[PDB]
DNA sequence: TCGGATGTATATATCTGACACGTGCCTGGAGACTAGGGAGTAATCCCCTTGGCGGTTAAAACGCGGGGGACAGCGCGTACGTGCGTTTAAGCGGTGCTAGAGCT
DNA sequence: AGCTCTAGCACCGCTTAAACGCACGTACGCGCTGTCCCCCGCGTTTTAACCGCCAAGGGGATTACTCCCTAGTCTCCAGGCACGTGTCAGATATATACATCCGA
């Protein structure tokens, strides 16, 4: 059983995302806050994605399932199917 | 001329009100909001149930589509209760004629 | 001929299964609508109606009022963390807003 | 020896990561996080390689967009260092918190 | 015929709205900023509402047209039918 | 000398009163003229149902009240009590309206 | 069926008419195909609402034209309406 | 001889496919013959707009093949395509180069 | 001031796997014809939106004192950035399998 | 219900550069202070929002009638889509311009 994988997102990875976002200086607490925010975001997206998988009675989460979850959450992603 | 019948959930909302609070009433403005709420939630669940059927290329909307739409649209514990209520209604209804 | 008994009464619901079934078809949500679909949907709508009315009635009693008004509906929808999430994008006419003031704005001794 | 002043390399990193399209999070660690979360909803789930990438693309874009909103509110406080209250405010004003 | 009615929204009216929003102190520059913000909000909602009226070939904007405009704009209004 | 409340004391009282009541804060007639003025730019000689004008007002006041809440948060975040135009501009920018 | 339908060929033909010397990557093409499908769904979706709001039973050019005016921004809508009306005019007149 | 409805309208997008999707999508009980022609033209026009701005961005980057970066740049640089696709995320599109003036050196 | 360090930009060459092009073919678009009712027209009505008068009376606007907070300026410290040696495990290539997505 | 055979899962081995711990400086967080201004609270003036009643007319809703447009059905065939292909665009590799930053 996978556990404590949130800490697997390296500190520079959060920095890189912040750097792309234009953040010049990052407080030491942003890393834990960012991990928590992403954890909540992924929980919401995966919950809906798994819900589409379960409704389709499938066992493999298809890329379209994620797109539909993102589409429902108002964050439609282009490039993974129509 | 005579005004054309306009349907509303008013009497049904009222019957539910009599169950949760027999002594409590509801103003026309509040009833209009409740009717709007019922219609909006209906369109949302029905809308998601439509997408679900289309995504699986199904021609019929069944309890499975409704149940899934409810799980998607309703947050947290509201989904569990709603699913339980929907399941109880359908299961008991199946026992009827 | 057997005595006509409404589908709602068979399901033990107040909401009209017949109307929900008619609307599911008239709205063209799908080519077909299974007989179980309007029963499940009517129960969900009836439950959510009861949920708001229960909290709205409590707000009315807390305000010493017997008739639910938009204010009671708004207070109920906004005080409940889940209803506020379901209706976060929804504005209720004449409902007003929650009586909340930021602590930093209050005077200090 | 020669040394760059604080923030000089940060500005260079900003240009580098804004000019570059590749995913900033390591693929394998992100995949494990997705697995850890999914297993709570349903056991022994499987994920298409494209599904894991889709989640990462959306997650990185969401966080990058959030960091921009965070940077804006940090600047509004006349600060350059982003703090957790900046992220909290951004998420709160965005309506997601 | 109608003109400058944006200035007709009195300064206290904006204050009352801000007071309901919990604002304890309001800088005098907020009034013009608020009027501009409200003007673009109404323009977006009215444009869609008028578009529904025109499509229906009607001459009067109905409450349903406003509700549909708002609904399409991403904010649902309860209490006016629909 | 006459009695006077300290600065901000009446503001808190006003906040409570307007947060307790549900009355619309903008005058109907000035708002009604503004609606028709904006509408006049899209189509001449338009008519508005009485309920249509009220619906626009309810949405407009709710939108501004919600925006002022978001504006108050960013003002407080800058450790300021007085809201400034940059607070509204930032709230709208973070809300994705600009 | 196994065959997957995509706007690839048509997007490519439009690309040739816009920049004949320019090609498009399969990844960029996937985005374009998903973009076309999303915009299609939006217009068709809003067109269905317009018909239902008027209790109409058929989608016509008026519903599409109105959906475009509602969904697309100011200049895009005005320009798109000109292209749409011109295409419908030529189609019906050419017969 | 059969002449496709797209060629009659002078369009590349398939009016037939748009008509089939409108009918099979259950958007309404009926679909007028003018609806797929009008819709195909709108989709074709918006496709040309995106490809034109994307092609220009490609040429500016001295590239001759459109990649997701050029699409994202085109969508975000255009004051209207960004509004239409404000809620849209583009795979591998990245973000626009932007640094706040407060962050730049003195 | 300013010169030295020095990352980024640009020009050339090799390569290659990606996409630009060709092919077979088949299925779904196009052509043809029909029913029939949805959409369109016309006539009617009436109700509810626009418009005005009257007047009042609450609400808005206007002036002012002044106070408290906006915020410029400063201290200063410790937090965060930069740099390094370390080493970690991500990424890649490869092999095994077989659940289970897809199709009939 | 049955078959297929895709590709997701699991594992090993190697690489290496991203991740990490740590050193250490001064950029920048922000506590503190001054101050002056502009926003508040209040009294006064005043104006146009609101109420209320009446006009009227138009346009929205309704009915009746029609018809011409679309859905169903059928035939047909070549457009479009997996397969096949290869060559050349941009990645990789190298050379090397030229601006910026820091320490003096």
> Hey, is D25 helix, strand or coil?
coil
Tokens (6 digits) for H82: 């960004």
For H101, the closest chain D residue by CA position comes to D75
How far apart are alpha carbons F41 and G71 in whole angstroms?
A: 20
Which sequence spans correspond to the domains of chain F?
Answer: 3-98
Q: Do B56 and A56 form a contact (C-beta atoms < 8 A)?
A: yes
Closest CA to B64 of B48, B41, B76: B48
Residues of E in contact with C96 (CB under 8 A): 20
The reply to whether residue D80 touches residue H94, judged by beta carbons under 8 angstroms, is no
E abuts G (3+ Cβ pairs < 8 Å): yes
Taking CB atoms and an 8 Å limit, are G22 and H58 in contact across chains?
A: yes
The alpha carbon of C33 is separated from its chain's Cα centroid by a whole number of angstroms, namely 24
CA-closest candidate to residue G53, choices B34, E71, C90, B11? E71
Q: What are phi and psi of G75, to 5 degrees?
A: -75, -40
Q: Answer yes or no: are the C-beta atoms of A21 and D64 closer than 8 Å.
A: yes
Question: Measuring CA to CA, which residue among G47, C26, C24 is closest to residue B48?
Answer: C24
Q: Give ∠ CA F31-F33-F38 in degrees, rounded to 5.
A: 95
Contacts 24+ apart (CB under 8 A), H61-65: H64/G21, H64/G22, H64/G23, H65/G22, H65/G23, H65/G24, H65/G25
Q: What CATH number is given to the structural domain containing A31?
A: 1.10.20.10
What chains are in contact with H, requiring at least 3 Cβ pairs below 8 Å? Answer: A, B, C, D, G
C-alpha to C-alpha distance for F54 and H36, rounded to whole angstroms = 38
Cα gap E42→E38, rounded to integer Å = 6
Chains interfacing with C (3 or more CB pairs < 8 Å): B, E, F, G, H
Rounded to 5°, the CA angle F77-F82-F85 comes to 85
Nearest CB to G53 within list E48, E54, E68: E68
Q: Is residue A24 left, alpha or beta, with left meaning phi > 0 and alpha meaning psi from -120 to 50?
A: alpha
- Tell me whether residue F1 is exposed, middle or buried, using C-beta atoms within 10 angstroms of its C-beta: 0 to 12, 13 to 18, 19 or more: exposed
Tally Cβ neighbours within 10 Å of residue A14: 23
Is residue F12 classed exposed, middle or buried when 0-12, 13-18 and 19+ CB atoms within 10 A define those classes? middle
| Backbone dihedral angles phi then psi of residue G23, each to the nearest 5 degrees | -105, 180
SS3 F91: helix
Nearest to D76 by CA among F65, F88, E18: F88
Which residues does H62 contact at the CB level (< 8 Å), separation at least 6?
none
Q: Please give, one letter per residue, the 3-state secondary structure of B5-54.
A: CCCCCHHHHHHHHHHHCCCCEECHHHHHHHHHHHHHHHHHHHHHHHHHHH
- Both tokens of D63, joined, read 């966080």
Distance CA E82, CA D80 (A): 48
Tell me the nearest-neighbour CA distance from H26 into chain C, angstroms.
Answer: 7
E strand map for chain D: 46-47, 81-82
F16 to chain C nearest CA, in Å? Answer: 7
Answer yes or no: do F95 and D92 touch at CB < 8 A.
no
B57 CB below 7 A from strand I atoms: no
- Give dist(CA H39, CA H5) in Å, integer: 13
Domain that holds residue E26: 1-82
B31 contacts chain A (CB < 8 A): no
Say yes or no for a CB contact (<8 Å) between B40 and E79: no
Asked whether the CA dihedral D29, D34, D35, D37 is positive or negative, the reply is: positive
Contacts of F63 in chain C (CB under 8 A): 91
As for how many domains chain C has, the answer is: 1
Residue D78 CB burial class (10 angstroms; 0-12, 13-18, ≥19):
exposed
Length of chain C: 109
Dihedral of the CA atoms H84, H89, H91, H95 (nearest 10)?
A: 90
H29 to chain C: closest CA residue: C28
Write the burial class of residue A67 (CB in 10 Å: 0-12 exposed, 13-18 middle, 19+ buried). Answer: buried
Q: Is the CB of G27 under 7 A from strand J?
A: no
- Across the interface, whether the CB atoms of D17 and A20 are under 8 A apart is answered yes
Distances (CA, A) of C70 to C59, E16, E75: 11, 20, 18
Distance, CA of F46 to CA of E49 (rounded, Å): 11
Tokens representing residue H91 in the block: 């795979």
What is the spatial distance between Cα B89 and Cα C43, in angstroms, rounded to a whole number? 6
Burial bucket for residue G31 (CB in 10 Å: 0-12, 13-18, 19+): buried
CATH number at residue C77: 1.10.20.10
Q: Is G31 on the interface with H (CB under 8 A)?
A: yes
Q: Which of residues 8-27 of D touch strand J (CB under 7 A)?
A: 8, 26
Sequence-separated (6 or more) residues with CB below 8 Å from residue D26: A9, A10, A13
- Measured over the CA atoms of residue F40, residue F42, residue F44 and residue F48, the dihedral's sign is negative
**Burial class of residue G38 (count of CB atoms within 10 Å of its CB; 0-12, 13-18, 19+):** middle
What are the structure tokens assigned to F42, written together? 């899209």
How far, in Å, CA of D29 to CA of E78, rounded? 45
Contact F74, E52 (CB under 8 A): no
Identify the residue among B33, B38, B67 best suited for mutation to test binding to C, counting C beta carbons within 10 A and taking the highest.
Answer: B33
Taking the C-alpha atoms of residue F69 and residue F91, their distance in angstroms, rounded to an integer, is: 9
Q: Tell me how far CA of residue F72 lies from CA of E80, F63, F68, in angstroms.
A: 30, 14, 6
Chain position carrying tokens 């040429």: H59
8-state DSSP, D81? E
**DSSP 8-state code for residue H4:** -
Instruction: Give the position of tokens 């000035």.
Output: F30
Helix (H, G, I), strand (E, B) or coil at C33: strand
Class at the top of the CATH hierarchy for domain D2-97: mainly alpha
Yes or no: say if F16 and C99 are a contact pair by the CB < 8 Å rule.
yes
Mutate to test the interface with G, among H28, H56, H93 (most CBs of G within 10 A): H28
Q: Does C91 touch chain E (CB under 8 A)?
A: yes
| CB B74 within 8 Å of CB A48 | no
Tally of CB atoms within 10 A around G16: 14
Cα of B29 vs its chain's centroid, Å: 20
d(CA C19, CA C8): 10
Q: Is the dihedral of CA C55, C60, C66, C70 positive or negative?
A: negative
Distance separating alpha carbons of residues C59 and C75, to the nearest angstrom: 7
Q: Where are the beta strands (DSSP E) in C5-82?
A: 32-33, 67-68
Domain span at H85:
1-106
> Determination method here?
cryo-EM
What is the bridge-based pairing of β-strands H30-31 and G58-59? parallel
State which nucleotides on strand I lie below 7 Å from a protein beta carbon: 5-8, 18-20, 27-31, 38-40, 45-50, 59-61, 66-71, 79-84, 89-92, 99-104
Token pair 């909540």 is at which residue? Answer: A40
Q: C94 and E76: CB-CB below 8 Å?
A: no
C-alpha closest to that of A8 among A28, A43, A38, A29: A38
* F3-98 is classed CATH 1.10.20.10: yes
What does the DSSP assignment read for H73-99? HHHHHSTTHHHHTTT-EETT-------
Taking residue B97's Cβ as centre, other Cβ atoms within 10 Å add up to 7
The rounded distance, in Å, linking the Cα atoms of E45 and A35 is 38
Cβ of D85 near strand J (under 7 Å)? The reply is no
Give nearest nucleotide to E30 (CA–C1'): J39
Residues of B in contact with H23 (CB under 8 A): none
CA dihedral of E36, E38, E42, E45, whole degrees rounded to 10 = 110
Distance of CA A46 to the CA centre of its chain: 8
CA distance F14 to F21: 11
Residue H30 is inside which H or E element, if any?
strand H30-31
CA nearest neighbour of C20 among C53, C44, C3: C44
* Dihedrals phi, psi of C67, to nearest 5 degrees: -110, 130
In terms of Cα–Cα distance, which of F49, F43, F94 is closest to F69?
F94
Q: In the block, which residue shows the tokens 């239902």? A: G52
Structure resolution, Å: 3.8
Asked if G48's CB is within 8 angstroms of C27's CB, the reply is no
Question: Element (H or E) spanning F82, and its range?
Answer: strand F82-83
């Amino acid at each position: 059983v996978l556990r404590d994988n949130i800490q697997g997102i390296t500190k520079p990875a959060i920095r890189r995302l912040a750097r792309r976002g234009g953040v010049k200086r990052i407080s030491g607490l942003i890393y834990e806050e960012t991990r928590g925010v992403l954890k909540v975001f992924l929980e919401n997206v995966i919950r809906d994605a798994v819900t589409y998988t379960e409704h389709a009675k499938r066992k493999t989460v298809t890329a379209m399932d994620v797109v539909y979850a993102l589409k429902r959450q108002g964050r439609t992603l282009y490039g993974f199917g129509g | 001329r005579r005004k054309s019948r306009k349907e509303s959930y008013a009497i049904y909302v009222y019957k539910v009100l009599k169950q949760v609070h027999p002594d409590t009433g509801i103003s026309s403005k509040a009833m209009s909001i409740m009717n709007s709420f019922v219609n909006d939630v209906f369109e949302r669940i029905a809308g998601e149930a439509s997408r679900l059927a289309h995504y699986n290329k199904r021609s019929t909307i069944t309890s499975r589509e409704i149940q899934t739409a409810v799980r998607l649209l309703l947050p947290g514990e509201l989904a569990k209760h709603a699913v339980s209520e929907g399941t109880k209604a359908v299961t008991k209804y199946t026992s009827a004629k | 001929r057997a005595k006509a008994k409404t589908r709602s009464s068979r399901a033990g619901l107040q909401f009209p299964v017949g109307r929900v079934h008619r609307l599911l078809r008239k709205g063209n949500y799908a080519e077909r609508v299974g007989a179980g679909a309007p029963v499940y949907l009517a129960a969900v709508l009836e439950y959510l109606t009861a949920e708001i009315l229960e909290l709205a009635g409590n707000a009315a009693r807390d305000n010493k009022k017997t008739r639910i008004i938009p204010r009671h509906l708004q207070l109920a929808v906004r005080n409940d963390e889940e209803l506020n999430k379901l209706l976060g994008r929804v504005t209720i006419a004449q409902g007003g807003v929650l009586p909340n003031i930021q602590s930093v704005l209050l005077p200090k001794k | 020896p020669h040394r760059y002043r604080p923030g000089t390399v940060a500005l260079r990193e900003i240009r580098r990561y804004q000019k570059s399209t590749e995913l900033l999070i390591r693929k394998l660690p992100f995949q494990r996080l997705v697995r850890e979360i999914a297993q709570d909803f349903k056991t022994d789930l499987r994920f298409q390689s494209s599904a894991v990438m889709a989640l990462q693309e959306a997650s990185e874009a969401y966080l990058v967009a959030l960091f921009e909103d965070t940077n804006l509110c940090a600047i509004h406080a006349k600060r350059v260092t982003i703090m957790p209250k900046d992220i909290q405010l951004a998420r709160r004003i965005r309506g997601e918190r």
